[PDB]
């Protein structure tokens, strides 16, 4: 009964960050050595926990949040960060306890003009772990939009122009945010030991 990090990290299709996919990891024994040890990652930052020490450490619930942003936005997947993603797509709490794992996916998500979406406009910042999937025509002006695009009325999602030749900051990056839950409940996710 091993935890399915394979169908999270090695998943063929990742999700757009506005609709970031969350996988509930429970009732299994995750081995995080496969992650922190093995694979070539552009970013593997852990907050409130050290990647080595989880191999014998139980958690009541682990949440694997996968999505796609571009290089310049991987820095926004952190506690106390701002920007397009952290405010309107995927917000981490300031007291976040978990690891943010990201890797370049230029060869996977850039073809010729693959299209991942991300939320441009939102009236307020996302609460931690909030997931806004509404396509309500965003109201920038004073006149209500009534679901028709126009001036001052914009579709709140926009496609990443993911094209292979992009600069590293513009190339797509796949992000998996493992958040570990300290609940007052039976522990369902543990290290192998």
């Amino acid at each position, epitope marked *: 009964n091993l935890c399915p990090f394979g169908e999270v990290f090695n998943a063929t299709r990742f999700a757009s960050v506005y609709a970031w996919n969350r996988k509930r990891i429970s009732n299994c024994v995750a081995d995080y050595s496969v992650l922190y040890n093995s694979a070539s990652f552009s970013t593997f930052k852990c907050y409130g926990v050290s990647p080595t020490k989880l191999n014998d450490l139980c958690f009541t619930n682990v949440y694997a949040d996968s999505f796609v942003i571009r290089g*310049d*936005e991987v820095r926004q997947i952190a506690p106390g960060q*701002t*920007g*397009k993603i*952290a*405010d*309107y797509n995927y917000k981490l709490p300031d007291d976040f306890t978990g690891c943010v794992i990201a890797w370049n996916s230029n060869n996977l998500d850039s073809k010729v*003009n693959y299209n991942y979406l991300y939320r*441009l*406009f*939102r*009236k*307020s*910042n*996302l609460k931690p772990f909030e997931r806004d999937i509404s396509t309500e025509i*965003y*109201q*920038a*002006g*004073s006149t209500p939009c009534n679901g028709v695009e126009g*001036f*001052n009325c*914009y579709f709140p999602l*926009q496609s990443y*122009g*993911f*094209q292979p*030749t*992009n*600069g*590293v*900051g*513009y190339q797509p990056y796949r992000v998996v945010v493992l958040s570990f839950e300290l609940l007052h409940a039976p522990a369902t996710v543990c290290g192998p030991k």
Partner: antibody
Framework: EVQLVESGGGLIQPGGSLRLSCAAS????????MSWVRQAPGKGLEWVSV???????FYADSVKGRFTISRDNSKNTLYLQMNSLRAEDTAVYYC???????????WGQGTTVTVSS | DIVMTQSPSFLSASVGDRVTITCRAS??????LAWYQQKPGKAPKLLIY???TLQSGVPSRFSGSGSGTEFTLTISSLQPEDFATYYC???????????FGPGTKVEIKR
């Protein structure tokens, strides 16, 4: 009525502060990316700052820690407080409406800020 | 560093000419470019966004083309109004929100 009217520019000594106001009409500033872009005389356009709809503010490293972008939802106004001004900040400052890839579709007339000792 | 370069710096053409202004990103920005017109004194005016889409209210003779590292702004038939300076800007250019080009000034040929 789809206009951006900024003021508050002028001639100040270096180190002195100066506040640019940008009254908006035809759009809500709190519902928009509102950015300040400056252009030195005879030079190109330089991004100064931006305020998101959610409230998060960003600045160019050239003005980081000296400038403060804000807004008045009541007055539907954008503000750029320029503290410890340096002569390098001498430029025409345009209040524009950022739309990330939809572009800076609506610009203000622009207010001149001359900083010199 | 990601730098935007405009060529030529000054361009000379007559009313009715097809003019093409080249913009070059040091690395690919795939379609995250806008094209702006500025006259002396007046504010910049957005002409093209997403490197090809024409802004509402902008003459149809303006067109934006190119994806990635080399972009063009084309006026099929130059009008008296189109004598101005043209700037290409980089959208979402992380450290600064926007990175503008050096500017191309279209001039009357004689």
């Amino acid at each position: 009525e789809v206009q951006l009217v900024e003021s508050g520019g002028g001639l100040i000594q270096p180190g002195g502060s100066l506040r640019l106001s940008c009254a908006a009409s035809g759009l809500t500033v709190s519902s928009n990316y509102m950015s300040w872009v400056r252009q030195a005389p005879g030079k190109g356009l330089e991004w100064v700052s931006v305020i998101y709809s959610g409230g998060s503010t960003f600045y160019a490293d050239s003005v980081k820690g000296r400038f403060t972008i804000s807004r008045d939802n009541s007055k539907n106004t954008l503000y750029l407080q320029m503290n410890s001004l340096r002569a390098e900040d001498t430029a025409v400052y345009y209040c524009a409406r950022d739309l990330d890839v939809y572009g800076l579709d609506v610009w203000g007339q622009g207010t001149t800020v001359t900083v010199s000792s | 560093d990601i730098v935007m370069t405009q060529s030529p710096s000054f361009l000379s053409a007559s009313v009715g000419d097809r003019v093409t202004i080249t913009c070059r990103a040091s690395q690919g920005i795939s379609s995250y470019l806008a094209w702006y017109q500025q006259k002396p004194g007046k504010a910049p005016k957005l002409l093209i966004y997403a490197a090809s889409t024409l802004q509402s209210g902008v003459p149809s003779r303006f067109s934006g083309s190119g994806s990635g590292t080399e972009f063009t702004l084309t006026i099929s038939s130059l009008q008296p109004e189109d004598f101005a300076t043209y700037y290409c800007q980089q959208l979402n250019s992380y450290p600064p929100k926007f990175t503008f080009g050096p500017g191309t000034k279209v001039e009357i040929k004689r």
